[PDB]
Design a protein around this ligand. Sequence first.
Ligand code: MG
Ligand code: MG
Lengths: 100, 154, 199, 66, 101, 138, 132, 131
Amino acid sequence: SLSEYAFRMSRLSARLFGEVTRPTNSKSMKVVKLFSELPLAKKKETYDWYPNHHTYAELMQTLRFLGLYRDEHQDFMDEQKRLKKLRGKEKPKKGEGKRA
Amino acid sequence: EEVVIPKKKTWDKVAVLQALASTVNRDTTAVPYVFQDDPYLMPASSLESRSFLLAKKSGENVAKFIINSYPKYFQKDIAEPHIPCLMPEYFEPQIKDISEAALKERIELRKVKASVDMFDQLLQAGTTVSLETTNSLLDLLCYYGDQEPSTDYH
Amino acid sequence: ERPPRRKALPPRTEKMAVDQDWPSVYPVAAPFKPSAVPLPVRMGYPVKKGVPMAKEGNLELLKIPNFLHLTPVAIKKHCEALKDFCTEWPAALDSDEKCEKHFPIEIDSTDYVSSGPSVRNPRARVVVLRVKLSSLNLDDHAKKKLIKLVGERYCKTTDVLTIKTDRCPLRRQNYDYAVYLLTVLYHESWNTEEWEKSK
Amino acid sequence: ETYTEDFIKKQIEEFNIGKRHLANMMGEDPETFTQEDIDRAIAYLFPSGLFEKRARPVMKHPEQIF
Amino acid sequence: HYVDWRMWRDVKRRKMAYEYADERLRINSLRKNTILPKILQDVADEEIAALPRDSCPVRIRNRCVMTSRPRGVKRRWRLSRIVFRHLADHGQLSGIQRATW
Amino acid sequence: VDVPKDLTKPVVTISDEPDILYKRLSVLVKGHDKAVLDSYEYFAVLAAKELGISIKVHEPPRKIERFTLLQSVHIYKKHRVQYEMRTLYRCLELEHLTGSTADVYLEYIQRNLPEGVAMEVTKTQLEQLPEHIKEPIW
Amino acid sequence: KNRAARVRVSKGDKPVTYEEAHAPHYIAHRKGWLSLHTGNLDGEDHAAERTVEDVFLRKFMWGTFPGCLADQLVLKRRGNQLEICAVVLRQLSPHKYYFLVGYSETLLSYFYKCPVRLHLQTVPSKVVYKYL
Amino acid sequence: TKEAPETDTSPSLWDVEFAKQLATVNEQPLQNGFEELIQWTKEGKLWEFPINNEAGFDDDGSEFHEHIFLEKHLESFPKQGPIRHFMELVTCGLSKNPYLSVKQKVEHIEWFRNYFNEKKDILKESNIQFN
Ligand SMILES: [Mg+2]
Ligand SMILES: [Mg+2]
């Protein structure tokens, strides 16, 4: 639904501005969209979604063993685990458990 | 008609900060800026002045000791532009091959004992050590008197 | 204990003269320090038959981004030292009409200042180039061909061609591209193709 | 909390000295600095957006506060 | 040291998907057009299907980074509604207040 | 009495390259607190007046983003908690600046940007026609 | 009944600070925010990473200065700088405070790759706003 | 003085250490807030103002034409036919991508060249000649 003049002017402008020049259907235009953006898996929001829980936990465990960080929570579960040994509720040996 | 554009003015990245600093003078009511500006924490004597700074420096040394002891925990770089000075330091030789090129590393790291031992091993193997490399080893050995430079902790 | 517990010294606002050089106390942006600010400022919603809380240990005053380092006295002293860095605007360019005659092209760029460890902002790369087609040496054919090539980039009411570029990573690359697009548009508009006779 | 008369007198002395410091900070005449100038200075130096004005930083005469 | 095994499985999926993203994009482009021969597009269909299952981006779940809650998460803060409210109601999120109008 | 005798002024070197000409700078500042934007405006306008810069200030309309969350940890769907983030604006419009003047003013006011305030600086630069566009080559 | 961040009435013997006495519907009315950054402004990025950092810093300072903190932290971000303002008590010796300030500023600067300052303000005892 | 010093020759340990002693005589503690900001700026810790969002990022010193004009890289591919049309769509998308470096964009194109070289036999069956 375009005149030859209008069609040829649109093709010249598309070449000037770096757009698709050959006639391309909407299905094949997805190839252009695929390579003009980063894949969702490659975006920093995606692969850096979580904080590095290994670093935070391990750093603060090392700082506790060094005497520079007081972990009130870990102190709480160390006292509970200590009172369970005196009560006899100790974790069994792996493999050599109650069942066999 | 012609319009005359003024010539550009160029200054260092710290020039504006230095211009603003010139406008202010020392505050006589305050202790030196290095100290915490708090009546309980301000040094109240010449001795506390020295000891309070030594305590702060000790804290910084302890932090640096941890950073270099556990580089893994401080390797996530989120700074843009990158800040090289805020990264962990690696003081150990990473070239394990016995060669003259690998020896140069130990001299750059100032490992007097490692370098001397490796130089001896290199000489026993019979490989050639350049005069410049030998001179660099002598510079390291002569300057420090064949004694290890002080380190944070072993 | 050999002595008693360390006693806090009196606040140093008691040593401050009422005609001091205040900019020397707060040279740069710093948190509100009750012992350094000689003002009986109070803050906090008062309890019944009560008064707003005093400044010592007042966390509400600590939460404010204060302007104690930017008193009118300091700002005037600061700007006197910064006059050496400034250059003089060309006196000829009195009005906007005069600016357009001598400098037809306008380049818009944006810088974004946020707080955080990274300065990067993907919006800073965009460059916008504006030029009125009346400032370009375009004949009748060239002007008509240009308006058809650019499309909605041209505004008939203002007669302004707006070229926005954001293809390249950097702003300098998008600026070089914007200038290049204007160049090829100008030269192509002047070129006459044989198929143009089918209009 | 009870405010004895001696305490109020010490608070008035503090307000007068602070009032002179505030005029010195803003580069104005200590002798013609009014309460409406104090409020304007406090608003600039300690900008608070809290919707309730009674929670904002205030520097008033002790007679009006206590 | 992740909140639970479920979060740990999502961490591995995000890592594997990142490693394979370029290869998946390249193969998928071969399939998402009518230009190339169908014989070639059929071989690409098999190749992308042979990649490890955990490289598929649709398998990633936006879990709360603090508690691992798989639903009720606000994407801007990556926090569950419960954790977000706990931080917001204590005044620890800059500029977030209770809305009344 | 203990006053510095002489002061080393920072070296500002006049270059042989011509300076940039900015027709306009649009300093849009965003914040959650209106009083903090009032103080920043007073500071920014005073700094502009002392440096000889023409400045005009207006307040673009505020943006209030609201969203809803569940009241309870479990069930009770009818009960919600509604939060919002208010973004207030102030726009400083500078005019007829050179590259050096803008560099100094922007460094000064950007370094003193109060915590919780963002800035977007739109710079309109005056340029001359490219050399290649003076006449057609065909 | 609502529960969120409400210190409930006791016998009139529980001392509460000014922050702990105000429920969440006062956060922009009578009390301010304990953190000020640009993440949550319209059109601004990285609100999520700022939030995680704030949560870590409040935990770090609680355990690094055990029993010293007299109220909640005030976190300030200006450009590249991070400033932690803490109201502490006057029980720990000054030497130990200076050590911990030098240690925390260095360790946190290397962890978050930015200049970090710690501004301590000491109080003789916890500031009581009211007795609930 | 000496007309030309041995700048190319690296400093010995003695020269380096002596230069460290000359930086200590002039070493004093920070005197105010401005001086701390100046030190941080010199070390690279504090951002340099006015803020430049591209500070420290020059994508390999690439030019605008290396990102936008990518047909030089399609010279090994068939000049006509489906593979040409397809690769023209790939390069058009790549030319519109501000998130990839030139190196990354050329890697995409290089992958397709090898892929179509692996699939020559399949392509011949469908009336396509690759290389
Ligand atoms: Mg899903
Ligand atoms: Mg209800």
